[PDB]
């Protein structure tokens, strides 16, 4: 009746041709206009198998996001093996917009609607769509921001939970705001993120309880990342064109799982390691004024130590294909022709 198959998917967006914001500039020319009445058809009585970990939709979104970043970011200096590239580095307008992934003729996208679907296995409530939901291509580590939520319980996704090297995606069912500010005026690189600790620790506590169901009720303990690059030992993200790096030691507080505002210390860095591929880039010092991003934390990226009565987890991230997975897990492409 249909065949699993891969094809070249295109993107669609509500990008504006008059916007100087870089995602708009990219998407107006990478992606078609969104269709104003998207049809979704329930496949009555169908059970279908899915696998979020072998889904070429993720690879294609990855290529587009790299394309977007390669066009849009203007580092003063780009260092890659045998190459120092120098150019002008004016400040840009930067704020992610959603994009949708869509099939050409002959293919359709199947969507798993089982609320507690973990990403692999049979799905009992399947529909066909022309395009995904709108996904913001937000590039971050540790916390997944401005994404979709799980509809019922908190979900744990891993390619293989027993393999301590495989990243665990936690999909939250209630978001918690994180508010990051480099205030106006004066260590210009000093910033911070505020999180309501009551709301956060309640959610973290539910996360701990859910992980307990997968690890035979053992004590769940969080520890800071064990080492590596700053982009992944910190919660890193781009806020208005600036590269923020936020220390998350206090976010993952085992005593709390308090009450008050949690304040994470952040720094805006100019010399960064590039997520798109090998090498480093240098940017200009931060723009003047109040730099602020208020984001919804909708997911968490973790690794488990593995290798007694406890399991130890540490904030993860860096493989930006895990970011796309957290939103594409419910979709797969099939061939009808």
């Amino acid at each position: 009746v249909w065949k699993d198959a891969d094809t070249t998917l295109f993107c669609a967006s509500d990008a504006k041709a008059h916007e100087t914001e870089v995602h708009n500039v990219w998407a107006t020319h990478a992606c078609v206009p969104t269709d104003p009445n998207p049809q979704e058809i329930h496949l009555e009585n169908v059970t279908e198998n899915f696998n979020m970990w072998k889904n070429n939709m993720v690879e294609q979104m990855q290529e587009d996001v790299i394309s977007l970043w390669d066009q849009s970011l203007q580092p003063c200096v780009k260092l890659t093996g045998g190459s120092v590239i120098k150019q002008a580095c004016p400040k840009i307008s930067f704020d992610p917009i959603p994009i949708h992934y869509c099939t050409p003729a002959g293919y359709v996208i199947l969507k798993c609607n089982d609320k507690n679907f973990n990403g692999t296995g049979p799905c009992k409530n399947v529909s066909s769509v022309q395009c995904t939901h709108g996904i913001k291509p937000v590039v971050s580590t540790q916390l997944l921001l401005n994404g979709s939520l799980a509809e019922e319980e908190i979900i744990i996704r891993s390619e293989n939970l027993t393999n301590n090297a495989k990243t665990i995606i936690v999909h939250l069912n209630k978001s918690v705001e994180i508010n990051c500010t480099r205030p106006s005026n004066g260590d210009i690189r000093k910033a911070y993120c505020e999180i309501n600790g009551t709301k956060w620790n309640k959610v973290l506590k539910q996360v701990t309880e859910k992980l307990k169901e997968h690890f035979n009720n053992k004590t769940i303990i969080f520890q800071p990342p064990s080492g590596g690059d700053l982009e992944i030992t910190m919660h890193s993200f781009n806020c208005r064109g600036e590269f923020f790096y936020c220390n998350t030691t206090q976010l993952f507080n085992n005593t709390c799982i308090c009450n008050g505002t949690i304040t994470l210390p952040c720094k805006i860095k100019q010399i960064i390691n590039m997520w798109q591929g090998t090498g480093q880039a240098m940017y200009a010092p931060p723009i003047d004024g109040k730099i602020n991003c208020v984001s919804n934390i909708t997911g968490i990226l973790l690794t488990r130590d593995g290798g007694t009565s406890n399991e130890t987890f540490r904030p993860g991230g860096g493989n930006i294909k895990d970011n796309w997975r957290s939103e594409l897990y419910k979709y797969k492409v099939v061939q009808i022709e």
Partner: antibody
């Protein structure tokens, strides 16, 4: 200012092939969607194909599906149209066009290249 | 043609004339991506109006575009001799048909 110059047209037998090239200058080629639009002698405009900025995605008219392929080389500022299995009804001036947006209208058009399919 | 335009329209200098372009609810009716092009003999098309009613820089404000339902319209006020040319409408049409054009309108300026 934008310039677009088409080459590679000419005379070709029915069933034959051609490759059209468009040389782009005056703008940052790699950031724009591009299209080919044709016009048979004495007749109206017909969209043929379009390509997004990176070239990862292409779109073609049903009348040319499976015969024509659009592509681009962003390192060389060139747009191509590979055309196979040509027929008389493909005879036309083929214009290269720079697009306002993918799927949108084309704010700059080359002078076109005539393609004549005949023995 | 997928969009329908009158084959011919005429006017006198200084008159206002309007060229219709009728499509369907999956093209003109679904988006605001209608463009109009002017084509003089032997020359490439020139964009006059895009996104229904926007004008590129350097195009006379005598040219304006509008839409109602599945019908777009190009209006040319204070008609001049040099407006005598062929005019084509065009729309996005969804992700498979993509872009559709009208059959064209030959505009003549009498006097």
């Amino acid at each position: 200012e934008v310039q677009l110059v088409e080459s590679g047209g000419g005379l070709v037998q029915p069933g034959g092939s051609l490759r059209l090239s468009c040389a782009a200058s005056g703008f940052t080629f790699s950031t724009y969607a591009m299209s080919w639009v044709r016009q048979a002698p004495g007749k109206g405009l017909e969209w043929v194909s379009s390509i997004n900025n990176s070239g990862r995605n292409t779109f073609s008219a049903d009348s040319v599906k499976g015969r024509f392929t659009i592509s681009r080389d962003n390192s060389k500022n060139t747009l191509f149209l590979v055309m196979n299995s040509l027929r008389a009804e493909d005879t036309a001036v083929y214009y290269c066009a720079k697009d306002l947006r993918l799927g949108g209208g084309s704010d700059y058009w080359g002078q076109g290249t005539l393609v004549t399919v005949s023995s | 043609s997928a969009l329908t335009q009158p084959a011919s329209v005429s006017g006198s200098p200084g008159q206002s004339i309007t060229i219709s372009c009728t499509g369907t609810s999956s093209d003109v009716g679904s988006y605001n991506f209608v463009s109009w092009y002017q084509q003089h003999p032997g020359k490439a098309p020139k964009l006059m109006i895009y996104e229904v009613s926007e004008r590129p820089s350097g195009i006379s404000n005598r040219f304006s575009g509008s839409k109602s339902g599945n019908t777009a319209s190009l209006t040319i006020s204070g008609l001049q001799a040099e407006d005598e040319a062929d005019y084509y409408c065009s729309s996005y049409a969804g992700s498979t048909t993509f872009r559709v054009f009208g059959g064209g309108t030959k505009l003549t300026v009498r006097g």
